Amino acid sequence: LFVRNEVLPTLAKIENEFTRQTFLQFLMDLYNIFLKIDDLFLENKTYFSILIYNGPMQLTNHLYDDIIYVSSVVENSDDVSPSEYCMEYISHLENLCEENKLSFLAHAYVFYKNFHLSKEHLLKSICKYLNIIKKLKSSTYVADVENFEFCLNKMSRKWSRWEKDNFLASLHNATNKMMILTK
C-alpha cells in the first residue's frame, strides 16, 4: 500500500540539517488553513469524494472550539484575526489546487501529518508557558491523519506513476512551507 511503502519513507528521507495575543492568532491561522483544505475538498466534491464520503475530519471543529476557549483568557480577543502570512498561504493552496489537485493534496496531507506529529508537545508547552489551564481539544488524537492515510491508499490505486511522482515530489515543497509557519 502506497502510504507505508512510498509516502512515509519519502517523509523520512525529507529529514536533513510570543504572548497570548500571538498564540490566539497562531490558532486562528491554523483554523483558516485547515478550513481552506476542507473548502477545497468540497469545491472539487467529485475528484475528492473518497476524502468527503470518508466523512469530515474533526480537527477544524476542535480548533474552532479551542479558539473560543483561548479567546476567553485573552484581553482584546475580538481584535485578533488571521495573519498576513496565513492569507498568503490560503491563496497559495487555492492556486496549488487550481493548477494540480494532487500538488494541493500533498500539501493538505503534510499539514495534517506534521500537525499530528508536533501538536501535543507544542500545545502543552505553549499552554504551560502562557499559564492556560485547560488542555485543548485540538491536541487530542482522533485518527484525522490515519483516516487521511487510509484515503490516500485508496486514491493511489487509481493514480498513474506520474501522479504518484507529482504527489511524492510535492511533499518536499509542503514540508518546507510548513517550517516557515514556525516562529
Residue numbers in the entry: 95 to 111, 133 to 298
Paper excerpt:
Nevertheless, malaria parasites express a divergent HO-like protein (PfHO, Pf3D7_1011900) with unusual biochemical features. Although this protein shows distant homology to HO enzymes, it lacks the strictly conserved active-site His ligand and does not degrade heme in vitro or in live cells. Heme oxygenases are ubiquitous enzymes that retain a conserved α-helical structure and canonically function in regioselective cleavage of the porphyrin macrocycle of heme to release iron. We have elucidated an essential role for PfHO within the apicoplast organelle of P. falciparum, where it associates with the apicoplast genome and nucleic acid metabolism enzymes and is required for organelle gene expression and apicoplast biogenesis.
As an initial step towards understanding this divergent function, we determined a 2.8 Å-resolution X-ray crystal structure of the HO-like domain of PfHO (residues 84–305) in its unliganded state, as we were unable to crystalize PfHO84-305 in the presence of bound heme. The structure obtained for apo-PfHO84-305 was highly α-helical with an overall fold expected for an HO homolog, including strong concordance in the positions of α-helix-forming sequences between PfHO, HuHO1, and SynHO1. Although the purified protein contained residues 84–305, electron density to support structural modeling began with residue 95 at the start of an α-helix, suggesting that residues 84–94 are disordered. A structural homology search using the DALI Protein Structure Comparison Server revealed strong structural similarity between PfHO and structures of HO enzymes from plants, mammals, and cyanobacteria. Superposition of crystal structures for PfHO and SynHO1 revealed very similar α-helical folds, with a root-mean-square deviation (RMSD) in the positions of backbone atoms of 2.11 Å for the two structures. Despite overall structural similarity between PfHO and SynHO1, we noted several points of structural divergence beyond loss of the conserved His ligand. In our PfHO structure, the distal helix adopted a similar architecture to that observed in the SynHO1 structure but featured bulkier, charged Lys-Glu residues in place of the conserved Gly-Gly sequence in active HOs. In contrast to the ordered distal helix, we were unable to resolve the structure of the C-terminal region of the proximal helix (residues 112–133) of PfHO due to weak electron density for these residues, possibly reflecting static or dynamic structural disorder in this region. We identified changes in the calculated electrostatic surface potential of PfHO84-305 between the proximal and distal helices that diminish the electropositive potential in this region compared to HuHO1 and SynHO1. Based on these observations, we conclude that PfHO is a divergent HO homolog that retains the overall HO fold but has lost key active-site and surface features that suggest a unique function independent of heme degradation.
